[PDB]
């Protein structure tokens, strides 16, 4: 069983996007109008599952091969890798990292995607992996294409991949999106603009990583995710 020996740095809700960001339409009816109630951290919040024993398949992190129907996906081969650390800079080992995305052309393999771009018969779109002892993770995939959506009349999502990260506790779990360095769609996307401070937008742009690329094969991008800092409890109930 898990022990309450930890506390997590309180979230900066001005750094993160707000609930109501009206330019992102769906958020109008999907956000609480009352205030969040603040609660002290107990063992219900500071513990969270550990996924070390989860049975991972050999290509779980390898989107070029995990779906495969006698073939290779079409599109830019890329490795996306990085490191998971907390706010104090400590690595976060054996953490679950999940990701999903569209194909090269912007189509998602899901019933609700009605978009004209076709499905790629050799591409699924999901991956998972556990971070190593040093907090490193990595996947290989194809760079997604941008896509249109019904928000405003000619709104287009920039290329991105979605990410989920568990971390040490349920207080640390996060879902986010990586974007790619230099995409002129970035500054225009209302979901991206839901983040008020531009330095926070920056933290989501995965940067081109030539030192990690495989010469004559695939490019690489680096994306480092930082989770709430974890500290030991001190002076509590005196």
């Amino acid at each position: 069983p898990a022990q309450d020996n930890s506390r997590f740095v309180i979230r900066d809700r001005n750094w993160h996007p707000k609930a109501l960001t009206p330019d992102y339409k769906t958020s109008i009816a999907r956000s609480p109008r009352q205030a969040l109630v603040s609660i002290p951290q107990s063992i219900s919040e500071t513990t969270g599952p550990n996924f070390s024993h989860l049975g991972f398949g050999a290509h779980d992190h390898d989107l070029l091969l995990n779906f495969n129907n006698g073939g290779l996906p079409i599109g830019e081969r890329i490795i996306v890798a990085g490191r998971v650390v907390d706010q104090y800079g400590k690595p976060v080992p054996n953490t679950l990292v999940e990701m999903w995305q569209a194909n090269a052309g912007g189509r998602h393999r899901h019933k609700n995607d009605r978009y004209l771009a076709p499905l790629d018969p050799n591409f699924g779109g999901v991956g998972r992996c556990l971070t190593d002892s040093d907090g490193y993770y990595s996947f290989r995939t194809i760079k997604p294409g941008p896509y249109p959506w019904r928000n405003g009349p000619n709104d287009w999502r920039p290329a991105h991949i979605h990410f989920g990260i568990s971390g040490p506790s349920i207080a640390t779990k996060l879902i986010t999106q990586l974007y790619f360095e230099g995409d002129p769609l970035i500054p225009m996307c209302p979901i991206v603009k839901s983040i008020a401070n531009p330095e926070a937008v920056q933290q989501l742009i995965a940067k081109l990583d030539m030192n990690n690329a495989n010469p004559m094969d695939c490019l690489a991008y680096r994306f480092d995710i930082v989770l709430r800092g974890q500290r030991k409890t001190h002076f509590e109930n005196c």
Partner: protein, 200 residues
């Protein structure tokens, strides 16, 4: 003042969350091992319950693309953190509501009691995280049980909510689905009867 590295910012889970987190549900082939909605296997100890709810938006309409993560103590009130699909009990699970399923369901045992940091017991509760399109950062809530009125009346978390009618929104209603004991927890995101959401 001292600044730490800032936290990667949250982004909505979007309409396609199921493709990476609820595989069956996006109507896609699964992997050998998936994190899903059966927290307890039939030979696990405790009282077996079935939970269900529906998710509402501000206009009184169903939210059919939501995805929920839950975290709970077992029956003797302990957090089983080592996830394993062979264990009889996992404290963690995941469920979703789909265009097909307007409703989520979770097969678990009623949790035991745990203390807060100060040593005071809390009433039985499931911790819940909610994600969907239009939600930029997920929401936190607690599901409590209606037949645990005495423990609920003294819980030091429910008491942090100022207004009494607001504590009510957190209380799942005992009912019966296929004659098997169930609790209903409906979530109202916004509006009249908005569910309380937390921050910690």
């Amino acid at each position: 003042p001292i600044e730490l590295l800032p936290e990667t910012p949250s982004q909505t889970a979007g309409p396609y969350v199921h493709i990476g987190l609820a595989l069956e549900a996006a109507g896609n082939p699964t992997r050998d091992q998936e994190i899903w909605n059966r927290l307890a296997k039939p030979d696990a100890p405790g009282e077996h319950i079935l939970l269900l709810g529906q998710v509402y938006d501000g206009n009184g309409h169903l939210v059919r693309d939501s995805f929920l993560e839950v975290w709970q103590a077992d029956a003797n009130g302990e957090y089983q953190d080592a996830y394993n699909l062979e264990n009889a009990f996992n404290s963690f699970g995941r469920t979703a509501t789909t265009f097909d399923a307007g409703e989520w369901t979770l097969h678990t045992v009623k949790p035991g009691v745990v203390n807060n940091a100060a040593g005071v017991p809390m009433a039985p509760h499931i911790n819940i995280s909610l994600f969907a399109r239009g939600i930029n950062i997920h929401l936190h809530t607690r599901l409590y049980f209606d037949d645990e009125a005495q423990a609920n009346a003294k819980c030091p978390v429910l008491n942090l909510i100022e207004q009494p009618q607001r504590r009510e929104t957190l209380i799942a209603k005992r009912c019966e689905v296929d004659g098997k004991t169930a609790y209903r927890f409906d979530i109202r995101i916004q509006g009249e009867g908005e569910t309380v959401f937390f921050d910690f």
